[PDB]
């Protein structure tokens, strides 16, 4: 919440977060999911739909 | 003589429906106007302008 709370822009951008360890192993899907949610949102803004 | 038969205007028929009518104008114009003034809440943005 502390690490989170240090952006100002929330109104455009936001933030993932996901612990992890040495031992994690699901970042990879992380990532993709995230990224796949980033380009979604992008195009809804162009198309003024968001 | 005969008689005319048509729907007429002053008939006790068509006041309803002439009033009806302007019932479903009025909704739509307040619609239309609750729309405008909310222009760009998250709502009515997500709906194609």
């Not at chain 1, 977060?17 to 970042?27: E, G, I, P, R």
């Not at chain 1, 990224?35 to 979604?40: A, E, F, L, R, Y």
């Not at chain 2, 038969?5 to 619609?31: K, M, N, Q, R």
């Amino acid at each position: 919440c502390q690490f989170e709370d240090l952006n100002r822009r929330k109104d455009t951008k936001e933030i993932y977060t996901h612990f992890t360890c040495a031992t994690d192993t699901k970042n990879v899907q992380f990532v993709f999911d995230a990224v796949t949610d980033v380009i979604i949102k992008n195009n809804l803004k162009e198309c003024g739909l968001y | 003589a005969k008689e005319i038969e048509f729907l007429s205007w002053t008939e006790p028929f068509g006041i309803a429906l002439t009033l009806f009518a302007v019932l479903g104008i009025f909704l739509t114009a307040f619609v239309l106007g609750v729309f405008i003034k909310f222009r760009n809440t998250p709502i009515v943005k997500a709906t194609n302008r």
